[PDB]
Amino acid sequence: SMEQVAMELRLTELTRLLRSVLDQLQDKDPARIFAQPVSLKEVPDYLDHIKHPMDFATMRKRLEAQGYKNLHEFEEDFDLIIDNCMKYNARDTVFYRAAVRLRDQGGVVLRQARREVDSIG
Numbered sequence: 350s351m352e353q354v355a356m357e358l359r360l361t362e363l364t365r366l367l368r369s370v371l372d373q374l375q376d377k378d379p380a381r382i383f384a385q386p387v388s389l390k391e392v393p394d395y396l397d398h399i400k401h402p403m404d405f406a407t408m409r410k411r412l413e414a415q416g417y418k419n420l421h422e423f424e425e426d427f428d429l430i431i432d433n434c435m436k437y438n439a440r441d442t443v444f445y446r447a448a449v450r451l452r453d454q455g456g457v458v459l460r461q462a463r464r465e466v467d468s469i470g
Contacts, residue, residue: 360418363418363420364412364415366465367423368412370458371409374405374427374451377450377455380443382434382444382447383405383430383451384406386402386406387404387437395437399433399436402433403429404430407426408423419466420466427455430451431452431455435449
């Protein structure tokens with residue numbers, strides 16, 4: 350149908366906007382601490398601690414399959430990256446600190462993204 354196509358163009362445009370959001374968030378991680386999944390070879394107990402691992406490469410895979418229906422779903426995955434790190438790693442660690450700085454800097458980007466998603470519909 351013509352409606353299914355219109356819907357698909359909206360999703361494609363959301364994907365376009367989320368791709369730009371993702372790039373902006375990932376620039377706030379210049380050490381690349383959050384770029385890839387935590388290695389289960391190097392942290393074999395990880396899944397005993399963290400039940401839903403997340404990282405920017407895994408978000409990008411979902412993004413490119415148009416697997417984010419709305420900004421809420423995308424934000425859920427970004428918050429997993431931060432929250433998983435802040436639980437597994439102690440406060441005095443470069444990892445925890447990186448997550449805090451990503452959360453703080455990402456807030457600004459996500460605030461305007463929400464306005465753009467509502468605005469453009």
